[PDB]
Nucleic acid binder design. Structure first.
Ligand SMILES: [Mg+2]
Lengths: 1323, 49, 586
RNA sequence: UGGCGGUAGCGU
DNA sequence: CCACGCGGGCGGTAGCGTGCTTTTTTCGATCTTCC
DNA sequence: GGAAGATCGAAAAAAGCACGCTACCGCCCGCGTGG
């Protein structure tokens, strides 16, 4: 298969045998798709701003015959570019211009024609746009909004686990939850009586709401209960017998009929007896009067002669009541069937408990319950009940909510109204009664089908709707009170509240967080992270054990491995590689349809609910070439259970082996040989790895580093294929091919790299070109790598030739000994960039001015300062130095408030940025920065001008040589002289003029563009109120490896550096090569990270291959032998999916590949379709290294020989962002707090360590008591004690004055500030 | 740090620690329900002296 | 008082807002408005509302949010009144009163240092310079190098050599206290005699790490410096780690050799059969060391040496007995550091972790603490050195999978198939089928583990001047397993046997087990099943930390008062004591 | 050389 | 037409509403034992 | 002979929720009157 030009440079030897049927999709698909849906026009609405506009608008002005309605909306072009927004420090936003139409209907006529129609486009705020990178730019900072995971709206029929009642009886509750509105619960009590709870208030009898729904007691009785007819006709009391109604009831009489004794008195009913009844199917059976005693009568029977009712509805029958019915003459008695288990009479008892008897009484009770302390009003109760449940604006079930509501109740109709109907409540309570009766099963909240993910678009739409109703109230009241004439619709709508709400959501929400730019994997994981926190979600501390478990439905959607350890475990997860989102919002996973025995290539996206019905095959299940399963009995998943199934009864197969793990966890090689905890925390530390100044390719990889690098925006991916024209460390110029220029276009692509830009974690973000001049490129190929990227491949750390053996106890436990050669090559040195800010705020006493001369300051310190007052670029200032000279007006000269370098900080100043408010006089360095930016813009414009002018002058030259045919005179003459050249009077002159005018138009247009760019650069930036000039200085420093630094491998091994041992003490092999890093094997057997060893072995093999290649490069061998060796190396393996053909590559391509492979051949091993040990042994045999993986090391310290062979090999190791220099802090006599006179806290504030309460407990545990008094009073907060201690220590006397702590005095004074009289007794 | 001042309230006011910290000291001493004491205190209900 | 609610001067003309100041301003405004209304004789309704809202302001000031809504501010969140920050976790009573930040303190990440004695710790030069600054100032003033404190400060920031010499003199016997952030038990904080070292990390003694429960994976130590003489004597007497030898919970020793140390001792006590130098007769451990260092013999060789054992008799005198014993050369080397009180039988074993602990306990009981500390330092040194010389390593070839295992699995499958067939025929129910499946798989797991252990323990076969013979294997993983340095039988079973029967999060055992070793590949389903238990345990610990801390705090508060005040009560009443028997075992 | 709250993350 | 001031709450005919657990108090409703 | 003491059960309120460390965001403020 044809390889891209960026891939031909280095081809990764990939193991694995399972072919891929679906390539890795766009990792950032969720965010981009959500925002595209949110910000695009939708003809059918129901998505984004269109849905909110249609739901909110129009607004009726309190029956004022005047409303305004939505017409259209448009998103304006952003004022500033993404790079411009980042540099300037403003929010990347776009205007929201909405064309609206206010109409004033004719007064005195409800249907009269509109008198005036005012239609206009109103600027209703600005909304933040999202970049291609998948991140938002708020206030000049890159923030990311994670996707929340919340319970889907609808009906959840669950139950308590049974411990609440303490008697072993469970209680079932159905909770109807809306997208917006009040929640409604129907719960069973220990007394088997239904109850209704609204918004977690005091419970009420369940029939109260039924009465409020204008349902009579007879209506409820016949709705929620079956009916039995008793006939006292023929003096036999014959009743309509249903054979299923007689199941499981002991006979209280003789039920013989038609001369057949089915079952007699004293005999419990048997299934054969019920069968005999079915065969006889007798309509009516004679009954004694005693049998119908406890049956409740559904119909409130009334005697027509007397005019009074014999018995009320739902009343238990009585012998006197039966006699009254008999003497009344009624023969058709109605009873409610009450089975002990099949049909529980809960509704009848609930109605009996209900005190309310009419709709008005029930509504009054509801009003009292919802609004305690207020007198009941019929109209008020009606309004409250209608608004609570049956109002469109208050209560609104979402489309997903309605779908879940109908699916749970098997309504079969997916579409429905947002409001809740009476039939919905009826069906919900009927299903709850069915669950109580013993049929049906309760749902599981932890099931992934009952939880949905809300992306950025949905939350943005909700916040927009909240702002819309907030401004809707204002426009409603303004239209209601004000006269509608000459009213210009701009001033009804005020954009301040909506804009404030949008800004608050995008800059201070619970889920909008600063992204971590440590390495591209970090941004990818942060953009693909799903959290359960935020509004409408769980709390960090009151989460519960059940919600932090992994459900069997998490397969293929949520990675069981990647999860932040700590209080957030379980609550935060990472999306799977192939997982995507359904339209309703539920996670879905790809699957391969299995037809007959052959697995086809068709891909179906199965959701969580529907996956539980079919039988899912296994990714690792063996498959033949035809497609059948070579094994009849294959492992499969069905109904959330893993079991063996036959060949015929399987319907779907996994798309790929790596379908389960996330993007972050999939980058761990040999993951199947690692423990879950070890792998989890190894991926966690892989997320945090600072970029080194030289990125080195990982020798052992999983193959998706290319995809991760390409999808992440750190690289510079070309948009159009072509040939490089001008390559440089700053800019790249691409001359696109003949197929890919739009008409009237230069065809020149200018890619501007970012060099040494600060990240969100004070880490370097540098871009280095990888292509060479004249190298052809195609669209999608990488042009310049970013941080931790090498040739378009993710490179978090470095390949170290490590060994596993104890070394004098320096690697006592999990501690790493690093050779001094690592420091020599600076393989782990990292650049850190810090930013300091100085604000020239304007005070009432006077403004602040940045000057060079400062009162009473050393002139030596002013040397670093310039005439403008800012430090020169490239200075080597250290701790205590001054960067910007600022003075502030004093009371009734100027006080020196100039920004100074924080103590313990040094480095080199790389750049300075200045922001100036409009009207404030520009500074000199501001002019220099503006002219530099203008020069860069003019250089780009001239890069376009040269090609455009060359084309135009070539055309005029063709015209001239066609007409004049003085080629020699033309070429000697300048092109400007060609322009003024005249010819004979025909098209030779007409077309010449028509081309000269186009040249002039092009020049004028490009001058206009230059003027626009100059205006954009020159325009002053907006600042905070009271601020005049802001100066930001960026320093940078190289941090090298020092003892105490934390270095961890990919597989999970952690630790800190113990000693920078000189290279002469390292163990050396027979060839004399140093063994570099030495680890401790003791951590291997316990913490299962065996994938280390294999990887190490594999790494060694890889290096050996590279070694061989390097040899063939050093001896100047011909291309034939190199090609043969590379082909043999690539062909190694058994049934590998990769088929690299070296013959098709040219000699130059083969030489380039060999040059790039001289430092070892990168190896790709899939997560679960990895390379077996046999392949590793064969690769080691190819490299002539021993197949056991262990060599004989010689000690360098003593020169002896180790008794046993040790394991050595090349392992990938990272550098954690846990440096030691920024963690050490020490204080002797620092500052103190104003209120407690106690030492401060934090390294940045030069504070002191906190003596915790357990420290005091331990001090009391020992017999030390003077040390406690030292910790408590003298050294912390006794100011007299502190001064006396300092003076005595200076004098040398180590004597103590106890004193009185000031914190106790503070507490005494504050308690006395209340009504308490805490004081001191004189004795 | 050890100097305090006094605010002269125009009308008497109840201390809240002795009122809301169950059991209510004011209510226990007066032998009246807490709700009645709260209603009387917050200038909405009248009490006979 | 005004200083207790200060108006912090923010950058520029802005002043930091104080909640107490806002509440007091509200109360004063309300009182002034009420006074004005009363003076003007306002209608009863207006003054009534004014009094009610004054009462609400008093509610806000005294205890915000106690009655109803808490009065908020510009932050849209409840403000802090007196009561809220008097109480609570962040309240003045338990945040700045019961535990407070102190001066002369520092913190830094730690690293292991082997060349350090039991009573010593490694302090960075910068940390020692900063922490002991007043002592250096005083010593410089006494020396006359600096006339005033300012001159001493300038000399310190200039970093001459005289300041380094003064610092070295100061630290000579000034102990410093080191502690961990989660100090749980009594041994959480201990003092050491610091020594100046390079680098930027605190070097810590390896043996005491188990006392701190602090692995060298990025943990940070906190250091405090006593000044007064009483505090220094507390450091030398009770803060000292040497005095802390027995745990206060059960009396067992707290310091215990572990990890590489014991591993080295294991390699110094295992005996081969045909090792170089077998049959040699030596006169003493010195000649054994000579032979080993010269390369003429191996540590596992079996020889006969003349040992002069010193034993304690009546009146505590030492009696020397010389005998030609049979042992290994490594044991002879180990005998060099053994003091003159222990018998030779304490060394003539395989020297496991428990053997080392028993030897240390016997040494402490017989010869006392002072020889015991030196003996512990010596055994640490010897174990580290000989573990380095051993060159023990873990490799993929060291991981031997028993040959029968696959066959066993096959038969197990056959068995389960038969049982499954019964459930197809209706002979047995689903529950009994599942129970029999679980029992069969457990039996298969036990058989596989036994076969793997038999394979690993005695795999090595060696010629001994003739026919082949068996001996305890030299496989590295078996060394770590038997010596007890790190790992257990269950972990080695998971490693080279089978993972076992995993469990669903609810607690139910999965019907099928994980039949693949960690050495070989694991399919997706088995990894997914294991993730359930992994997440279960991780979440268990995460939620366990907080409850453990709360229980510890409550227990500490309950028993804070109890101290020993008298010698003997004279009471004749006491509790009964009998061995606890639950039935079938004691 | 001015620290008070809040938010997020890290190590046990 | 700016500086003090004031009270500071969003949301809405008000009420603070949502998958923790334990302890204490209160209050209404009922069961029961006597004046 | 049917009310007052005792009980019960549900509701409502209070109280806490391990320890260190790191980073950043808001510490005014917006609407209503008197010179
Ligand atoms: Mg640790």
């Amino acid at each position: 298969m044809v390889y891209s030009y960026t891939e031909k440079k280095r081809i990764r030897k990939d193991f694995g045998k399972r072919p891929q049927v679906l390539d890795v999709p766009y990792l950032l698909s969720i965010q981009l798709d959500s925002f595209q849906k949110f910000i695009e026009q939708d003809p059918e609405g129901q998505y984004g701003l269109e849905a909110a506009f249609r739901s909110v608008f129009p607004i009726q002005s309190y029956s004022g015959n005047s409303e305004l309605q939505y017409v259209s909306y448009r998103l304006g072009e952003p004022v500033f570019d993404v790079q411009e927004c980042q540099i300037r420090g403003v929010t990347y936003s776009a205007p929201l211009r909405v064309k609206l139409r206010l109409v004033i209907y004719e007064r005195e006529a409800p249907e009269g024609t509109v008198k005036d129609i005012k239609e206009q486009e109103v600027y209703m705020g600005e909304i933040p746009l999202m970049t291609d990178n998948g991140t938002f730019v708020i206030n000049g900072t890159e923030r990311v909004i994670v996707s929340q995971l919340h319970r889907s709206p609808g009906v959840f029929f669950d139950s308590d686990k049974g411990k609440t009642h303490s008697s072993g009886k469970v209680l079932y509750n159905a909770r109807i939850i809306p997208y917006r509105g009040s929640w409604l619960d129907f719960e069973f009590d220990p007394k088997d009586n239904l109850f209704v709870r609204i918004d977690r208030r005091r419970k009420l009898p369940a029939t109260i709401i039924l009465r409020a729904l204008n349902y009579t007691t007879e209506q409820i009785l016949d709705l929620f209960f079956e009916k039995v007819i008793f006939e006292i006709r023929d003096n036999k009391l014959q009743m309509e017998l249903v054979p299923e109604r007689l199941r499981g009831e002991t006979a209280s009489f003789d039920i013989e009929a038609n001369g057949k004794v089915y079952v007699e008195k004293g005999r419990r009913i048997t299934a054969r007896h019920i069968r005999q009844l079915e065969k006889d199917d007798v309509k009516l059976i004679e009954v004694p009067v005693e049998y119908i005693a406890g049956k409740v009568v559904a119909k409130d029977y009334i005697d027509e002669s007397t005019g009074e009712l014999i018995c009320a509805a739902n009343m238990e029958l009585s012998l006197d009541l039966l006699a009254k019915l008999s003497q009344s003459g009624h023969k058709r008695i109605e009873t409610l069937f009450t089975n002990d288990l099949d049909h529980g009479p809960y509704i009848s008892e609930t109605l009996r408990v209900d005190p309310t008897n009419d709709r008005l009484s029930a509504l009054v009770e509801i009003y009292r319950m919802m609004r305690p302390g207020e007198p009941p009003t019929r109209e008020a109760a009606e309004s409250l009940f209608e608004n609570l449940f049956f109002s469109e604006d208050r209560y609104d079930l979402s489309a997903v909510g309605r779908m879940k509501f109908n699916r749970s109740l098997l309504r079969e109709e997916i579409e429905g109204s947002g409001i809740l109907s009476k039939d919905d409540i009826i069906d919900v309570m009927k299903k709850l009664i069915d669950i109580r009766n013993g049929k049906g099963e309760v749902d599981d909240i932890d099931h992934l089908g009952n939880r949905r993910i809300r992306s950025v678009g949905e939350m943005a739409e909700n916040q927009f709707r909240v702002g819309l109703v907030r401004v809707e109230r204002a426009v409603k009241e303004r239209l209601s009170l004000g006269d509608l004439d000459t009213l210009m619709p701009q001033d009804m709508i005020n954009a301040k509240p909506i804009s404030a709400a949008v800004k608050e959501f995008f800059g201070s929400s619970q889920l909008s967080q600063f992204m971590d730019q440590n390495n591209p994997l970090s941004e990818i994981t942060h953009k693909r992270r799903i959290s359960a926190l935020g509004p409408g979600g769980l709390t960090r501390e009151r989460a519960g054990f059940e919600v932090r478990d992994v459900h069997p439905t998490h397969y293929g959607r949520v990675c069981p491995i990647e999860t932040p350890e700590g209080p957030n475990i379980g609550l935060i997860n990472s999306l799977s590689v192939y997982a995507q989102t359904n339209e309703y919002g539920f996670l879905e996973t790809p699957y391969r349809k299995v037809t007959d025995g052959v697995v086809t290539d068709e891909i179906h996206y199965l959701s969580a609910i529907e996956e539980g019905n079919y039988v899912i095959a296994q990714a690792n299940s063996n498959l033949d070439e035809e497609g059948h399963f070579v094994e009849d009995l294959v492992t499969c998943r069905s109904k959330g259970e893993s079991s063996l199934f036959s060949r015929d009864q399987v319907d779907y197969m996994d798309v790929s082996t790596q379908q389960v793990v996330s993007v972050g966890a999939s980058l761990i090689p040999f993951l199947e040989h690692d423990d879950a905890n070890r792998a989890l925390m190894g991926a966690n530390m892989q997320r945090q790895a600072v970029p080194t100044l030289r990125a080195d390719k990982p020798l052992v990889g999983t193959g998706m580093e290319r995809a991760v690098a390409v999808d992440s925006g750190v690289t510079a991916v070309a948009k159009r294929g072509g040939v490089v024209q001008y390559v440089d460390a700053s800019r790249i110029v691409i001359k696109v091919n003949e197929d890919e220029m739009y008409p009237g276009e230069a065809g020149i692509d200018i890619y501007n790299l970012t060099k040494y830009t600060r990240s969100n974690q004070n880490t370097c973000i540098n871009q280095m070109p990888c292509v060479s001049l004249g190298e052809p490129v195609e669209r999608g190929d990488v042009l310049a790598d970013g941080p931790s990227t090498d040739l378009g491949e993710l490179a978090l750390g470095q390949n170290m030739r490590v060994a596993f053996m104890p070394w004098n106890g320096y690697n006592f436990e999990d501690s790493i000994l690093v050779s001094e050669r690592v420091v020599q090559e600076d393989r782990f040195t990292t650049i850190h960039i810090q930013e300091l800010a100085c604000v020239s705020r304007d005070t009432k006493l006077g403004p602040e001015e940045i000057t060079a001369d400062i009162p009473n300051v050393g002139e030596a310190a002013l040397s670093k300062l310039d005439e403008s007052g800012i430090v020169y670029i490239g200075a080597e200032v250290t701790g205590g130095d001054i960067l910007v000279g600022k003075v502030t007006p004093k009371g009734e000269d100027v006080k020196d408030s100039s920004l100074r370098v924080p103590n313990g900080v040094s480095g080199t100043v790389i750049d300075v940025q200045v922001f100036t408010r409009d009207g404030v006089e520009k500074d000199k360095r501001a002019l220099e920065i503006e002219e530099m930016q203008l020069k860069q813009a003019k250089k780009d414009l001239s890069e376009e001008l040269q090609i455009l002018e060359a084309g135009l002058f070539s055309r005029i030259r063709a015209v001239l040589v066609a007409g004049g045919v003085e080629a020699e005179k033309l070429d000697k003459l300048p092109r400007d002289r060609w322009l003024e050249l005249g010819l004979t009077d025909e098209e030779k002159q007409n077309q010449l003029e028509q081309l000269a005018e186009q040249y002039d138009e092009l020049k004028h247009e490009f001058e206009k563009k230059l003027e626009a760019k100059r205006r954009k650069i020159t325009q002053g930036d907006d600042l905070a109120p009271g601020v005049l000039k802001i100066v930001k200085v960026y320093l940078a420093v190289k941090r090298r490896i020092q003892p105490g630094d934390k270095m961890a491998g990919r597989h999970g091994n952690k630790g800190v550096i113990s000693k920078i041992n000189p290279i002469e003490d390292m163990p050396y092999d027979e060839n004399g090569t140093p063994v570099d890093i030495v680890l401790n094997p003791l951590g291997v057997p316990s913490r299962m990270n065996i994938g280390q060893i294999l990887e190490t072995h594999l790494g060694m093999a890889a290096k050996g291959i590279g070694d061989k290649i390097n040899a063939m490069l050093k001896q100047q061998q011909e291309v034939a032998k190199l090609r043969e060796f590379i082909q043999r190396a690539y062909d190694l393996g058994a049934d590998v999916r990769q088929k690299v053909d070296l013959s098709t590559f040219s000699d130059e391509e083969v030489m380039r590949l060999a040059e790039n492979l001289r430092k070892g051949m990168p190896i790709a091993t899939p997560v679960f379709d990895g390379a077996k040990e046999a392949e590793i042994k064969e690769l080691l045999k190819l490299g002539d290294l021993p197949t056991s993986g262990q060599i004989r090391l010689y000690d360098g310290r003593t020169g002896e020989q180790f008794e046993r062979p040790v394991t050595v090999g090349y392992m990938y190791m990272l550098k954690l962002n846990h440096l030691v220099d920024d963690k050490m802090h020490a204080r002797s006599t620092g500052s103190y707090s104003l209120v407690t006179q106690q030492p401060l806290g934090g390294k940045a504030q030069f504070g002191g360590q906190r003596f915790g309460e357990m420290e005091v407990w331990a001090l009391e545990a020992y017999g030390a008591a003077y040390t406690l008094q030292e910790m408590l009073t003298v050294k912390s907060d006794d100011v007299n004690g502190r001064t006396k201690m300092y003076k005595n220590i200076v004098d040398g006397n180590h004597q103590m004055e106890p004193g009185m702590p000031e914190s106790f005095n503070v507490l005494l004074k504050e308690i006395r500030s209340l009504g308490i009289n805490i004081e001191l007794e004189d004795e | 740090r050890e100097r305090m001042g006094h605010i002269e309230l125009a009308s008497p006011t109840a201390h809240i620690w002795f009122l809301k910290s169950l059991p209510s000291r004011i209510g226990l001493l007066l032998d009246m329900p807490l709700r009645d004491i709260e209603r009387v205190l917050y200038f909405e209900s009248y009490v006979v002296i | 008082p005004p200083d207790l609610r200060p108006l912090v001067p923010l950058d520029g003309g802005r002043f930091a807002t104080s909640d107490l100041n806002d509440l007091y301003r509200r109360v004063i405004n309300r009182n002034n408005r009420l006074k004005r209304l009363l003076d003007l004789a306002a209608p009863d309704i207006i003054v009534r509302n004014e009094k009610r809202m004054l009462q609400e302001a008093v509610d806000a000031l005294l205890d915000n949010g106690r009655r109803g809504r808490a009065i908020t501010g510009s932050n849209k969140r409840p403000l802090k009144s007196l009561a809220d920050m008097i109480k609570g976790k962040q309240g003045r009573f338990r945040q700045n009163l019961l535990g407070k930040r102190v001066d002369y303190s520092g913190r830094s990440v730690i690293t292991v240092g082997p060349y350090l004695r039991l009573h010593q710790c490694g302090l960075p030069k910068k940390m020692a310079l900063e922490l002991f600054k007043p002592f250096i100032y005083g010593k410089l003033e006494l020396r006359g190098l600096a006339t005033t404190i300012k001159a001493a400060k300038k000399m310190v920031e200039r970093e001459e050599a005289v300041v380094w010499d003064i610092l070295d003199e100061v630290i000579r016997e000034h102990p410093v206290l080191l502690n961990r952030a989660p100090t749980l038990h009594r041994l959480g904080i201990q003092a050491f005699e610091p020594v100046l070292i390079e680098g930027k990390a605190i070097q810590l003694h390896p043996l005491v790490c188990a006392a701190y429960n602090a692995d060298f994976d990025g943990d940070q130590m906190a250091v405090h410096v006593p000044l007064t003489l009483e505090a220094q004597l507390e450091a030398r007497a009770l803060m000292m780690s040497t005095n802390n030898i027995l745990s206060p919970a059960n009396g067992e020793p707290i310091i215990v050799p572990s990890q590489d140390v014991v591993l080295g001792l294991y390699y110094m006590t295992r005996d081969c059969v045909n090792a170089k130098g077998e049959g040699m007769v030596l006169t003493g451990p010195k000649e054994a060391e000579r032979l080993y260092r010269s390369g003429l013999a191996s540590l596992h060789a079996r020889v006969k040496v003349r040992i002069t054992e010193y034993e304690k008799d009546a009146n505590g005198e030492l009696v020397a007995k010389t005998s030609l014993k049979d042992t290994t050369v490594g044991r002879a080397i180990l005998w060099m550091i053994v003091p003159k009180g222990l018998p030779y039988s304490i060394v003539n074993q395989a020297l496991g972790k428990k053997a080392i602990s028993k030897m240390l306990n016997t040494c402490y009981r017989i010869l006392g603490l002072k020889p015991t500390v030196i003996f512990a330092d010596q055994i640490m040194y010897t174990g580290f050195a000989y573990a380095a010389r051993s060159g023990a390593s873990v490799g993929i070839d060291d991981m031997v999978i028993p040959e029968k295992k696959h066959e066993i699995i096959s038969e197990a499958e056959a068995e389960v198939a038969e049982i499954q067939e019964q459930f197809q025929s209706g002979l047995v129910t689903a529950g009994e089928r599942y129970n029999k499946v679980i029992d069969i798989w457990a039996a298969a797991n036990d058989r596989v583990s036994k076969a793997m252990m038999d394979n690993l323990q005695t795999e090595t076969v060696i010629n001994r001047d003739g026919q082949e013979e068996k001996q305890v294997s030299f496989n590295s993983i078996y060394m770590m397993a038997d010596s007890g340095a790190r790992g257990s039988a269950a972990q080695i079973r998971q490693l080279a046997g089978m993972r076992g029967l995993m469990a669903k999060p609810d607690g139910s055992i999965i019907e099928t087990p994980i039949t693949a070793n960690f050495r070989e590949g694991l399919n997706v389903l088995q990894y997914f099943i294991s993730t359930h238990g992994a997440r279960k345990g991780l979440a268990d610990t995460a939620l366990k930390t907080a409850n453990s801390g709360y229980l510890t705090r409550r227990l500490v508060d309950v028993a804070q008062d109890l101290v020993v005040t008298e010698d003997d009560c004279g009471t004749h009443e006491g509790i009964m004591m009998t061995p606890v028997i639950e039935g079938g075992d004691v």
